Amino acid sequence: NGLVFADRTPHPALTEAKHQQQFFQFRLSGQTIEVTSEYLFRHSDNELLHWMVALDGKPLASGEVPLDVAPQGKQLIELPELPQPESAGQLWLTVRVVQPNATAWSEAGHISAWQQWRLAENLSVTLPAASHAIPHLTTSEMDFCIELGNKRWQFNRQSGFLSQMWIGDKKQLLTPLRDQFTRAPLDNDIGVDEATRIDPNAWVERWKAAGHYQAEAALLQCTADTLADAVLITTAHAWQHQGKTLFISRKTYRIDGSGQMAITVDVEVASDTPHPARIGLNCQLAQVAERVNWLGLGPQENYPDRLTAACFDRWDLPLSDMYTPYVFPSENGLRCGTRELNYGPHQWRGDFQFNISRYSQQQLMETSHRHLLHAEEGTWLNIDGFHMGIGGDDSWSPSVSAEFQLSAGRYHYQLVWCQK
């Protein structure tokens, strides 16, 4: 149940605890930062505030101000006039409290606190430059095919899913892109303190009994249309278990002359089915790259009810860091609030949560120990419009608070897939 592994390597949860247990609080009013000390005895005599303003990860301005706060006291820091850019995006302010000097318990340059705020946002009004190229649709009995030069997109008309993508003669997918509504259960979803308890109230059990893990997709609609400058595929799927419809998924895929595939997803969830762990898509990619790079919350694993410690910026990590090696395997390594994701030739833009690794949700839920996991061929990608909270208040009864359960009934998310 540790914040650390037996060898004292941090679990991702530790960083959330560090952030929430901060000894300095911050408010932002206009250009003023108010820093309040939660110490009771010490003045801030080994602390400096670093501030940084960035546009979608791009550093615009930064600075340093010494901290001189009495225990329980306040210091107002006035920011210099910020040299606003004209280009579209969201400006983010980040502050960090840094300890310049080593102590008996920390190294020089130790970070004790941080915080972020959204500053100005400039919405993108300027149209994209109209591409000259135009995609073409090749219909067969079994498939819709879209080609754009080297690029090729294949929609299986029997299943209703994007079954394959081609760059010239190279395959991009090892498994089709399908809706996913389940996760490999966390310890908080399993809910039991004792071994032989088959607790009928736990999330995994409610999910198992409703047939979430074994629901079969049934195709309702799979049509293709040609527009002036794009091809539009439209699909509708029903997930059923024992005649009962749990989820309906309605999708458009819009492929334009730029080679961008725009996916719209609208999901209905039956109000009497237990709230799903996630509402997303997954596929097994053929590529295995070294680095994952994203504009979103990071660097560490973060979930909707555990993301306060994560900062929004441009993060770049090795693939292996995008997996969390919990001894008992589960859904893991998610990052939330992501606007852009980069992996090998692929780029996904939108507002989504994702995890990426060499292990399928299936392998993760079938394996009892982490050392028994084996890297699957290619890379498993889950991209979620929505993900349920993880809970934790205890680990033997449902603990995901109401506001983090997927209860809306109707959900919408949109993704742009392109090959940069």
Binding interface with a second copy (CB under 8 A)? 90, 118-123, 125, 127, 220-221, 223, 225, 227-228, 232, 238, 240, 245, 248, 266, 268, 270-272, 351, 403, 410, 412, 414
Q: Which of residues 31-50 bind Na ion (CB under 5 A)?
A: 44, 47
According to CB under 5 A, which one of 329, 333, 385, 389 is a site residue for Na ion? 329
Closest CB 256 distance from a second copy, rounded Å: 11
Closest CB 244 distance from a second copy, rounded Å: 8
Q: Annotate 78-104 with DSSP letters as a single string.
A: EPPPP---SSSEEEEEEEEEEE-S--S
Closest CB 147 distance from a second copy, rounded Å: 20
Asked if residue 1 belongs to a known ligand binding site, the reply is yes
- In the bound state with a second copy, the residue whose beta carbon lies nearer, of 329 and 385, is 385
Q: Which does 197 bind (CB under 5 to 8 A by kind): a second copy, Na ion, none?
A: none
Q: Annotate 115-151 with DSSP letters as a single string.
A: EEEEEEEE---SPPP--S---EEEE-SSEEEEEETTE
- In the bound state with Na ion, the residue whose beta carbon lies nearer, of 16 and 47, is 47
| Percent composition of the chain: helix, strand, coil (DSSP 3-state, to 5) | 10, 50, 45
- In the bound state with a second copy, the residue whose beta carbon lies nearer, of 90 and 293, is 90
Asked if residue 396 belongs to a known ligand binding site, the reply is yes
DSSP E strands: which ranges in 123-227? 136-139, 143-148, 151-156, 162-167, 170-171, 178-180, 216-226
- In the bound state with a second copy, the residue whose beta carbon lies nearer, of 329 and 350, is 350
Q: Which does 47 bind (CB under 5 to 8 A by kind): a second copy, Na ion, none?
A: Na ion
Contact in structure between 301 and 335 (CB atoms under 8 Å): yes
Residues 6+ apart with CB under 8 A from 366: none
Euclidean distance between CA atoms 257 and 386, whole angstroms:
30
> What token pair was written down for 261?
């595939």
> What token pair was written down for 348?
């996904």
- In the bound state with a second copy, the residue whose beta carbon lies nearer, of 270 and 418, is 270
- Residues annotated within a binding site: 1, 396
Residues that bind Na ion (CB under 5 A): 44, 47, 67, 329
